[PDB]
Amino acid sequence: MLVKGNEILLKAHKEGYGVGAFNFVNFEMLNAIFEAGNEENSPLFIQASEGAIKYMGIDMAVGMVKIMCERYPHIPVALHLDHGTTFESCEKAVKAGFTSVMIDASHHAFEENLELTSKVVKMAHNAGVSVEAELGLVNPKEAEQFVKESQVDYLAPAIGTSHGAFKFKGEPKLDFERLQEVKRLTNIPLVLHGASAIPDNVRKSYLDAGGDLKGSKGVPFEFLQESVKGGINKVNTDTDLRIAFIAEVRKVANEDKSQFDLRKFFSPAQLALKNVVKERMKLLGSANKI
């Protein structure tokens, strides 16, 4: 059922594996994510950004997730506010039924990031909700201080990732020795943002359907595994899903100009998304952890 984000991530912290945190914006993405979790016997972090919540309405975002939990009552599921920008945003998500909220004030200085994060934590913990924060590259000693002062449940340390399909213009590399240092001093679950890899087969599908991925590329599979070894426990994944989904939508549009049955577009798009999720669960080590 729907559980506190910390319940899932504490396990992954103790046993040293990574749980994927998969964004959704509608029913098709959510269904494919849940089907993958059921087929790989993996716990699920379900994420909604503030833009996705505006698109769906927060009543629908939580409502659809609750329905899916009743459909697969054996899968541990956390519903996570992705990149909350204000206290009030995190507070609205708590009242709506989210079991995990992230407050992104990494763009602020240490002192204001910590003051706002601490405010979110108090409100959230009062309602039984776990909190993620961000910091950053990261400096391990202030991370130690940040975590102890804020009492946040998980932390996203900056180690060389960024959202989108365009992660590194040159060689891909992440500062894993910084990560191991953060992990030691904080001893809490850690979060990797911008962790989409753009698998080879997903890139092929998008470009085969006439898509333009520009010079985009993401974290190699090897560096996601090394991140988990370093102590990452929550791996944010979104771009990979969207590319795999829209590749199939473009394909159907191209191959049959007379097709306007929505299910003919989105049934193959769901399957491609679902396979990206299933492979990621195995890569990160959360398969068969229910």
Residue closer to a copy of itself, measured from CB, 211 or 220: 211
Q: Please report how close the Cβ of residue 186 comes to a copy of itself at its closest, in angstroms.
A: 34
Distance from C-alpha of 246 to C-alpha of 89, rounded to nearest angstrom:
29
Which residues fall within 8 angstroms of residue 170, CB to CB, at 6 or more apart?
none
Q: Would you count residue 242 as binding Zn ion (CB under 5 A)?
A: no
Q: From the list Na ion, a copy of itself, Zn ion, none, pick the one residue 263 interacts with, judged by a Cβ distance below 5 to 8 Å according to partner type.
A: a copy of itself
Q: Which does 102 bind (CB under 5 to 8 A by kind): Zn ion, a copy of itself, Na ion, none?
A: Na ion
- Closer residue to Na ion, CB minimum distance, 46 or 102: 102
CA dist 155 and 217 (Å) reads 25
Q: Which stretch binds Na ion (CB under 5 A): 31-39, 98-106, 206-214, 250-258?
A: 98-106
- Which residues lie below 8 Å from residue 19, measured CB to CB, with a gap of 6+? 8, 9, 12, 42, 43, 44, 45, 233, 234, 235, 284, 286
**Closer to Zn ion at the Cβ: 193 or 203?**
193
Q: Confirm or deny that 13 is annotated as ligand binding.
A: no
Based on the shown chain and the rule CB under 5 A, indicate whether residue 193 belongs to the binding site for Zn ion.
Answer: yes
> Which entry of Zn ion, Na ion, a copy of itself, none binds 261, CB below 5 to 8 A by partner kind?
a copy of itself
Which alpha helices (DSSP H) does the chain contain, by range?
5-15, 27-40, 50-56, 58-71, 87-96, 110-126, 140-150, 176-186, 200-208, 221-230, 239-255, 262-284
Examine the residue annotation and report whether 175 is marked as an active-site residue of this protein.
no
What is residue 209's DSSP assignment? T
Binding-site sequence positions for D-glyceraldehyde 3-phosphate: 49
Binding-site sequence positions: 49, 83, 104, 134, 163-164, 193-196, 236-239
Active site (catalytic) residues: 82
